[PDB]
Motif scaffolding. Sequence first.
Motif, mmCIF file in Angstrom:
data_model
loop_
_atom_site.group_PDB
_atom_site.id
_atom_site.type_symbol
_atom_site.label_atom_id
_atom_site.label_comp_id
_atom_site.label_asym_id
_atom_site.label_seq_id
_atom_site.Cartn_x
_atom_site.Cartn_y
_atom_site.Cartn_z
ATOM 1 N N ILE A 107 -4.615 -25.950 -17.380
ATOM 2 C CA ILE A 107 -4.821 -25.430 -15.475
ATOM 3 C C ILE A 107 -6.346 -25.800 -15.066
ATOM 4 C CG2 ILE A 107 -5.139 -23.737 -13.708
ATOM 5 C CD1 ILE A 107 -2.587 -22.340 -15.396
ATOM 6 N N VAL A 108 -6.328 -26.389 -14.264
ATOM 7 C CA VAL A 108 -8.198 -26.681 -12.988
ATOM 8 C C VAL A 108 -8.192 -27.050 -12.163
ATOM 9 C CG1 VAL A 108 -8.292 -29.056 -15.727
ATOM 10 C CG2 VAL A 108 -7.706 -28.771 -13.194
ATOM 11 N N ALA A 109 -9.288 -26.649 -11.776
ATOM 12 C CA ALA A 109 -10.121 -26.383 -10.583
ATOM 13 C C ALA A 109 -10.463 -27.528 -10.225
ATOM 14 C CB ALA A 109 -10.624 -25.520 -10.406
ATOM 15 N N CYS A 110 -9.767 -28.048 -9.022
ATOM 16 C CA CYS A 110 -10.334 -29.175 -8.462
ATOM 17 C C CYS A 110 -10.788 -29.553 -7.101
ATOM 18 C CB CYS A 110 -9.166 -30.572 -8.379
ATOM 19 S SG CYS A 110 -8.303 -30.682 -9.770
ATOM 20 N N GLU A 111 -12.288 -30.398 -6.777
ATOM 21 C CA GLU A 111 -13.234 -29.756 -5.484
ATOM 22 C C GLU A 111 -13.284 -31.833 -5.393
ATOM 23 O OE1 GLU A 111 -16.131 -27.197 -5.854
ATOM 24 O OE2 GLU A 111 -14.751 -25.875 -5.190
ATOM 25 N N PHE A 120 -12.425 -25.374 -15.466
ATOM 26 C CA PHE A 120 -11.241 -25.643 -16.762
ATOM 27 C C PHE A 120 -10.639 -24.048 -15.911
ATOM 28 C CE2 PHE A 120 -8.724 -24.570 -20.488
ATOM 29 C CZ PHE A 120 -8.159 -26.107 -20.356
ATOM 30 N N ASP A 121 -9.962 -23.696 -16.005
ATOM 31 C CA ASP A 121 -9.104 -22.343 -15.326
ATOM 32 C C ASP A 121 -8.588 -22.011 -16.463
ATOM 33 O OD1 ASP A 121 -9.759 -20.094 -13.049
ATOM 34 O OD2 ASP A 121 -7.811 -20.295 -13.308
ATOM 35 N N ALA A 122 -7.634 -21.522 -16.905
ATOM 36 C CA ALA A 122 -6.978 -21.860 -18.471
ATOM 37 C C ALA A 122 -5.788 -22.883 -18.820
ATOM 38 C CB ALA A 122 -5.760 -20.499 -17.416
ATOM 39 N N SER A 123 -5.103 -22.237 -19.742
ATOM 40 C CA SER A 123 -4.125 -23.485 -20.668
ATOM 41 C C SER A 123 -2.462 -21.665 -20.765
ATOM 42 C CB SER A 123 -4.776 -23.612 -21.904
ATOM 43 O OG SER A 123 -4.700 -22.710 -22.829
#
Length: 124
Positions: A107-111, A120-123
């Motif tokens: 799970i990634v944050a995009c901008e 990188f938020d989580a796996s």
Amino acid sequence: KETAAAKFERQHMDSSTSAASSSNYCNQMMKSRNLTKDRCKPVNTFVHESLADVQAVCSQKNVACKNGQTNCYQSYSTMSITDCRETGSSKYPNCAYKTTQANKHIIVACEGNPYVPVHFDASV
Ligand SMILES: O=c1ccn(Cc2cn([C@@H]3O[C@@H](CO)[C@H](O)[C@H]3O)nn2)c(=O)[nH]1
């Protein structure tokens, strides 16, 4: 100066290896990617897929970020990753890490424009 997109690549991308991360992998990678410069960064994940595949995640499954923001995305397919977690006996500057390979959805944050991964938020 280093863009957020570039910083994500430095902190989180390692396409060069498929997984094969030795037990030494995190000790070496956390140092070389400069994540041990000021303190020992406690937790960090490297992704072993192509940059194109990881960038593609920004157009995949929209999910809530851990901090509550709405700009996170979960990969539809599992990806090869390595988690690095600081050991209990690790003392800066000699930062020490446990290396754990896995295949998980990232799970990634995009901008930005272009819309690219910046955290990188989580796996899962
Ligand atoms: O399973 C995980 C869970 C969290 N993280 C943290 C992280 C976040 N980031 C994002 O980019 C950094 C830019 O300074 C920030 O620490 C965070 O927003 N980097 N590492 C993992 O690496 N793996």
